[PDB]
Design an enzyme around this catalytic site. Structure first.
Site, PDB file in Angstrom:
ATOM      1  N   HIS A 144       0.826  -1.202   0.000  1.00 52.69           N
ATOM      2  CA  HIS A 144       0.000   0.000   0.000  1.00 52.69           C
ATOM      3  C   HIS A 144       0.835   1.216   0.000  1.00 52.69           C
ATOM      4  O   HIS A 144       0.292   2.315  -0.237  1.00 52.69           O
ATOM      5  CB  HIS A 144      -0.999   0.024   1.116  1.00 52.69           C
ATOM      6  CG  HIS A 144      -1.858  -1.189   1.142  1.00 52.69           C
ATOM      7  ND1 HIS A 144      -2.470  -1.669  -0.016  1.00 52.69           N
ATOM      8  CD2 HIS A 144      -2.283  -1.964   2.159  1.00 52.69           C
ATOM      9  CE1 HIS A 144      -3.162  -2.746   0.309  1.00 52.69           C
ATOM     10  NE2 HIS A 144      -3.104  -2.922   1.626  1.00 52.69           N
TER      11      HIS A 144
ATOM     12  N   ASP B  33       0.659  -8.407   1.135  1.00 52.39           N
ATOM     13  CA  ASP B  33       1.025  -6.965   1.230  1.00 52.39           C
ATOM     14  C   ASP B  33       2.508  -6.693   1.120  1.00 52.39           C
ATOM     15  O   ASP B  33       3.069  -6.075   1.996  1.00 52.39           O
ATOM     16  CB  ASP B  33       0.437  -6.307   2.538  1.00 52.39           C
ATOM     17  CG  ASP B  33       0.542  -4.768   2.553  1.00 52.39           C
ATOM     18  OD1 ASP B  33       0.652  -4.101   1.501  1.00 52.39           O
ATOM     19  OD2 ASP B  33       0.584  -4.240   3.663  1.00 52.39           O
TER      20      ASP B  33
ATOM     21  N   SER C 119       5.163   0.653   8.412  1.00 47.28           N
ATOM     22  CA  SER C 119       4.737  -0.162   7.280  1.00 47.28           C
ATOM     23  C   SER C 119       5.867  -0.391   6.287  1.00 47.28           C
ATOM     24  O   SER C 119       6.561   0.522   5.909  1.00 47.28           O
ATOM     25  CB  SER C 119       3.624   0.498   6.496  1.00 47.28           C
ATOM     26  OG  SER C 119       2.625   0.622   7.393  1.00 47.28           O
TER      27      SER C 119
HETATM   28  N1  LIG Z   1       0.937  -1.492  10.757  1.00 47.30           N
HETATM   29  C1  LIG Z   1       0.430  -0.424  11.371  1.00 47.30           C
HETATM   30  O1  LIG Z   1       0.328  -0.307  12.556  1.00 47.30           O
HETATM   31  N2  LIG Z   1       0.035   0.641  10.476  1.00 47.30           N
HETATM   32  C2  LIG Z   1       0.308   0.732   9.100  1.00 47.30           C
HETATM   33  C3  LIG Z   1      -0.195   1.831   8.582  1.00 47.30           C
HETATM   34  N3  LIG Z   1      -0.053   2.270   7.253  1.00 47.30           N
HETATM   35  C4  LIG Z   1       0.827   3.136   6.860  1.00 47.30           C
HETATM   36  O2  LIG Z   1       1.663   3.536   7.666  1.00 47.30           O
HETATM   37  N4  LIG Z   1       0.813   3.565   5.574  1.00 47.30           N
HETATM   38  C5  LIG Z   1      -0.070   3.171   4.479  1.00 47.30           C
HETATM   39  C6  LIG Z   1       0.791   3.407   3.271  1.00 47.30           C
HETATM   40  C7  LIG Z   1       1.583   4.590   3.578  1.00 47.30           C
HETATM   41  C8  LIG Z   1       1.715   4.580   5.075  1.00 47.30           C
HETATM   42  C9  LIG Z   1       1.647   5.910   5.752  1.00 47.30           C
HETATM   43  O3  LIG Z   1       0.588   6.307   6.167  1.00 47.30           O
HETATM   44  N5  LIG Z   1       2.785   6.617   5.850  1.00 47.30           N
HETATM   45  C10 LIG Z   1       2.956   7.837   6.446  1.00 47.30           C
HETATM   46  C11 LIG Z   1       2.051   8.863   6.205  1.00 47.30           C
HETATM   47  C12 LIG Z   1       2.304  10.128   6.737  1.00 47.30           C
HETATM   48  C13 LIG Z   1       3.462  10.365   7.460  1.00 47.30           C
HETATM   49  C14 LIG Z   1       4.354   9.315   7.651  1.00 47.30           C
HETATM   50  O4  LIG Z   1       5.553   9.534   8.338  1.00 47.30           O
HETATM   51  C15 LIG Z   1       5.523   9.290   9.639  1.00 47.30           C
HETATM   52  F1  LIG Z   1       5.322   8.018   9.859  1.00 47.30           F
HETATM   53  F2  LIG Z   1       6.589   9.657  10.290  1.00 47.30           F
HETATM   54  F3  LIG Z   1       4.509   9.882  10.190  1.00 47.30           F
HETATM   55  C16 LIG Z   1       4.126   8.066   7.103  1.00 47.30           C
HETATM   56  C17 LIG Z   1      -0.887   2.475   9.626  1.00 47.30           C
HETATM   57  C18 LIG Z   1      -1.638   3.652   9.692  1.00 47.30           C
HETATM   58  C19 LIG Z   1      -2.221   4.010  10.900  1.00 47.30           C
HETATM   59  C20 LIG Z   1      -2.099   3.228  12.025  1.00 47.30           C
HETATM   60  C21 LIG Z   1      -1.279   2.107  12.018  1.00 47.30           C
HETATM   61  C22 LIG Z   1      -0.704   1.746  10.810  1.00 47.30           C
END
Ligand SMILES: NC(=O)n1cc(NC(=O)N2CCC[C@H]2C(=O)Nc2cccc(OC(F)(F)F)c2)c2ccccc21
Length: 217
Positions: free
Chosen positions: A41, A85, A170
């Site tokens: 993703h 994934d 992720s």
């Molecule tokens: N396995 C886990 O627990 N999780 C995995 C998640 N999914 C992601 O993480 N992403 C989806 C793809 C891109 C990515 C993302 O949002 N990346 C992202 C977005 C904005 C900022 C960012 O940088 C920083 F992490 F530092 F904030 C990364 C996630 C989201 C919320 C809570 C749990 C989460």
């Protein structure tokens, strides 16, 4: 990473930051000279991979940014599931390898990690529920759960008692015995809640797929 610590600089030379528009988006793992594994993703602007880093922002001679020649999501990945994934990113050139930039061996043998084993997960994901984004690489050790507690055969879990992976982790690595065993999944989920384990893609379930793609250079 919630409930973790700053990693020692360049001590996990397989780590990668998968970047959009110069900003960290996902973790990733160097698994060959020219290939980084991350999560599907993440690919759904400019996707680049930063190797050799500890600080996202501070000058470091080991840090080098790469463009992506080819992105290969798992063909059965779908945007609404965390099944299949995985994502393979071919770098525009072979990475300059050294003590700060090294591939990690990955698990090709389809056996579960022994429940209760502590594995290391690293990343630049958020470090608290206010969404604080770290500049330096974080990591935590976490105990692997038995399959029955985690409930597929293609996922593993780890304890989530306040220590956990979370947003932005992720795509990054779950390491045991010096071998990549899991890849942090990229679905939203509550983090840090002991009743709601961390989820990770079992790399050993994907051995043929990985080999295939890496065969394609
Ligand atoms: N396995 C886990 O627990 N999780 C995995 C998640 N999914 C992601 O993480 N992403 C989806 C793809 C891109 C990515 C993302 O949002 N990346 C992202 C977005 C904005 C900022 C960012 O940088 C920083 F992490 F530092 F904030 C990364 C996630 C989201 C919320 C809570 C749990 C989460």
């Amino acid at each position: 990473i919630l409930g973790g610590r700053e990693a020692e600089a360049h001590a996990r030379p397989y780590m990668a930051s998968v970047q959009l528009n110069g900003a960290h988006l996902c973790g990733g793992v160097l698994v060959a000279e020219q290939w980084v594994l991350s999560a599907a993703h993440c690919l759904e602007g400019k996707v680049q991979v930063l190797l050799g880093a500890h600080s996202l922002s501070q000058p470091e001679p080991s840090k080098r940014l790469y463009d992506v020649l080819r992105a290969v999501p798992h063909p059965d990945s779908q945007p609404d599931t965390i099944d299949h994934d995985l994502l393979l990113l071919q770098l525009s050139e072979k990475a300059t390898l050294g003590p700060a930039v090294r591939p990690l061996p990955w698990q090709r043998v389809d056996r579960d990690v022994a429940p209760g084993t502590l594995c290391d997960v690293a990343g630049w994901g958020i470090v608290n529920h206010a969404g604080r984004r770290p500049d330096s690489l974080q990591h935590v050790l976490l105990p692997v759960l038995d399959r029955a507690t985690c409930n597929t055969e293609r996922l593993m879990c780890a304890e989530s008692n306040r220590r956990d992976s979370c947003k932005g982790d992720s795509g990054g690595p779950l390491v045991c015995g010096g071998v990549l065993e899991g890849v942090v999944t990229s679905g939203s989920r509550v983090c840090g809640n002991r009743k709601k384990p961390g989820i990770y893609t079992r790399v050993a379930s994907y051995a043929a797929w990985i080999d295939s793609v890496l065969a394609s250079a």
